[PDB]
Amino acid sequence: DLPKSVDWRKKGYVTPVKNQKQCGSAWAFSATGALEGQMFRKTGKLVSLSEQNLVDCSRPQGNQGCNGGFMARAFQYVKENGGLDSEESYPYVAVDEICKYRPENSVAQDTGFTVVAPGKEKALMKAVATVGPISVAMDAGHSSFQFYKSGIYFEPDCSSKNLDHGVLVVGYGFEGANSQNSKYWLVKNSWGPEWGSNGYVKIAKDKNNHCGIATAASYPNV
Ligand SMILES: [Cl-]
């Protein structure tokens, strides 16, 4: 059945780490990271997508730009809008601006999104293994996360229910030889390559949905 490990970065599904800077747009980076991987799966072409397009244009769907938002509202906006522009055509500036969506510059589409059963790490494992990178929310409100550097992240004060940060699960794995021991979720952050481990963090896997990684997972349908 399911592989002992997955890493979509090794198959060309993931763009290099990005930096949201001083703007609460992590939800937008998480949504573009999931759409980048589904579009790569569908066309074989990896194209960086515009977080700014989401920040400026998805207020009608319930997002609030640099004040926060949700990946599912972003996929709903891509669906209702009929498209989403490339990173190159609609560059990121980390401030709320006027919607400048240009259909001629669109390089992605989705028909809606699929939800992972909430709180179910095994359902999340199956989604990651068979679909590609998955958008997820997590409790990142801790100094231990801010200064994380390496190893399997584990924070006693983490919540599986009150989440404040959107990220992207690009795979899962384990340390050592036993595939069922010291497992982790491979997670792409949006605080620059300089943060954490080359912009990534290993989050403890199958330890009671630590930090809520499987509480609100979803992926776009392309
Ligand atoms: Cl969401």
Residue numbers in the entry: 1 to 222
Show me the paper's own sentences about this structure.
Addressing the elusive specificity of cysteine cathepsins, which in contrast to caspases and trypsin-like proteases lack strict specificity determining P1 pocket, calls for innovative approaches. Hence, we set out to determine the crystal structures of cathepsin complexes with representative peptides of cleaved substrates. As a working model, cathepsin V was chosen because of the resolution of diffracting crystals (up to 1.3 Å) and crystal packing with accessible active site cleft. Reactive site mutants C25A and C25S of cathepsin V were used in structural studies.
